[PDB]
Amino acid sequence: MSNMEKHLFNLKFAAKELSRSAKKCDKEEKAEKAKIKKAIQKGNMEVARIHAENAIRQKNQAVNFLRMSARVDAVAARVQTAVTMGKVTKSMAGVVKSMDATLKTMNLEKISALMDKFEHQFETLDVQTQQMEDTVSSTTTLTTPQNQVDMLLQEMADEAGLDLNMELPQDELSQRLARLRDQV
C-alpha cells in the first residue's frame, strides 16, 4: 500500500460514506412524512410542524450529501489515473534500462557475427552428414545393387500405371541469363 494508494483508498471510502448518508436522509424523509400524516389526523399541529421541518431538512441534507459524494468520487477517479500511470511509467523506465543493458552486451555488430557463424557452422555440419552418408552407402553397397532397386521401382511404377522408366536418369530464366553471361 503506497502513499497514494492509501489516499485513494480513503477517498473512495469517503465517497461511499457520503453516499450512505444521502440514503439515510432519504429513508428518514419518508419516515418523517409518515409522522406528519399521523399528527394531522390527531390534530397535533405543533407536532406536525416539527415533523414537517425534519422532513424538509432531511430532504435538503440528502442533496448535499449526494453532491459531495459526486465530488469526492471525481477526485478519486483522478487519483486512480495518477496511481496507474505512475506504475506504468515506472515499468517503462525499467524496460528502457534493461534493454539499454542487453543491447550493449549484445549489440548489432555482435549479432551480425553470431548469425554469420551459426550459418557457416551448419554448412560444415551438412558437409559432415553427406560424407557420413556416402560412407554408409559404400559400406553397404552389395546389400543394395543398383539394378535391383531400379527393377523394383519399375515394377511398382507399372503396377501404379505410372508412365516412367526408372533405369534411365531423370529454369528457362536461368538458361537465358547463362546465355547472357556467355554472350557478353
Give the H/E segment covering residue 72: helix 45-105
| Interactions with its own copies, residue window 28-57 (CB under 8 A) | 46-47, 50, 53-54, 57
**176 near its own copies, rule: CB under 8 A:** no
Which of 121/162 has CB closer to its own copies?
Answer: 121
DSSP, collapsed to helix, strand or coil, labels residue 20 as: helix
Residue 70 beta carbon to its own copies: minimum distance, rounded to whole angstroms: 6
Nearest-angstrom CA–CA distance, 141 and 23: 97
Residue type, 16: K
**14 near its own copies, rule: CB under 8 A:** yes
Nearest-angstrom CA–CA distance, 111 and 109: 5
Which of 93/156 has CB closer to its own copies?
Answer: 93
Which of 3/170 has CB closer to its own copies?
Answer: 3
* From 38, 56, 98, 151, residue interacting with its own copies (rule: CB under 8 A): 98
Span interacting with its own copies, options 120-128, 155-163, 175-183, rule CB under 8 A: 120-128
Nearest-angstrom CA–CA distance, 162 and 153: 11
Span interacting with its own copies, options 80-88, 149-157, 158-166, 175-183, rule CB under 8 A: 80-88
Residue type, 110: K
- Looking up cell 450512505 gives 20
Span interacting with its own copies, options 100-108, 150-158, 176-184, rule CB under 8 A: 100-108
Nearest-angstrom CA–CA distance, 112 and 110: 5
| Interactions with its own copies, residue window 124-143 (CB under 8 A) | 124-125, 127-129, 131-133, 135-140, 143
Which parts of the chain are beta strand (E)?
Answer: none
